Design an enzyme around this catalytic site. Sequence first.
Site, PDB file in Angstrom:
ATOM      1  N   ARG A   9       0.856  -1.174   0.000  1.00 44.79           N
ATOM      2  CA  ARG A   9       0.000   0.000   0.000  1.00 44.79           C
ATOM      3  C   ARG A   9       0.897   1.231   0.000  1.00 44.79           C
ATOM      4  NH1 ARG A   9      -4.829   0.405  -1.711  1.00 44.79           N
ATOM      5  NH2 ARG A   9      -5.460  -1.419  -0.479  1.00 44.79           N
ATOM      6  N   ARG A  10       0.798   2.011  -1.065  1.00 48.13           N
ATOM      7  CA  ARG A  10       1.755   3.075  -1.337  1.00 48.13           C
ATOM      8  C   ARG A  10       1.869   4.056  -0.176  1.00 48.13           C
ATOM      9  NH1 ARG A  10       4.331   5.717  -5.907  1.00 48.13           N
ATOM     10  NH2 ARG A  10       4.095   3.694  -6.970  1.00 48.13           N
ATOM     11  N   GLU A  82      -4.496  -7.287  -6.985  1.00 47.33           N
ATOM     12  CA  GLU A  82      -3.287  -8.103  -6.909  1.00 47.33           C
ATOM     13  C   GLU A  82      -3.485  -9.321  -6.008  1.00 47.33           C
ATOM     14  OE1 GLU A  82      -0.345  -5.110  -5.874  1.00 47.33           O
ATOM     15  OE2 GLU A  82      -0.137  -4.539  -7.986  1.00 47.33           O
TER      16      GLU A  82
END
Length: 140
Positions: A9-10, A82
Site C-alpha cells: 500500500r503506497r 493483486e
Amino acid sequence: TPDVFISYRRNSGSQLASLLKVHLQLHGFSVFIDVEKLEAGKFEDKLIQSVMGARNFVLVLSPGALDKCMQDHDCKDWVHKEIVTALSCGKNIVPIIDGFEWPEPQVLPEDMQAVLTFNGIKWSHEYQEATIEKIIRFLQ
C-alpha cells in the site's frame, strides 16, 4: 520473469516494500516491485500479468493496508486486484505484518477473504536479519 512479486500500500508500506526488495535481491531472488519494473503500457494489464508470472506473492501489510479493499466489490483497488490474482492463481502468498491488525473476514470482499488463511511473518525492527531469513525460508 520474477521469483517474487511485492504487493504493498503506497501510502504506508512503501519503505518496507523497498527494504524487502533490496534484501531479497541481495539473496539472489528476482523481484518485481512497481517502481523498478513496471514499464510502458496499460498498467492494469501489466500489473496483473506480473503477479501471474511470479512464483511468490509477498504482501506487505502495513497499518490499514487493506482498508481501501473494504467494500471494493467492483475490485477497483489495485492491492485488492493483486491479491485476487495471487489467490486465484494459487501462488505462494507470504504476508508480512508491520503494525497491521487482521480484519474480521466479513469486512473484506469474498474474493479476497482467503488471504487471511495464510501464515504470515511478523516484521521485527529489532531482529530484521532474522525476519529476512524467515521470509527466505517461506519463498519457493
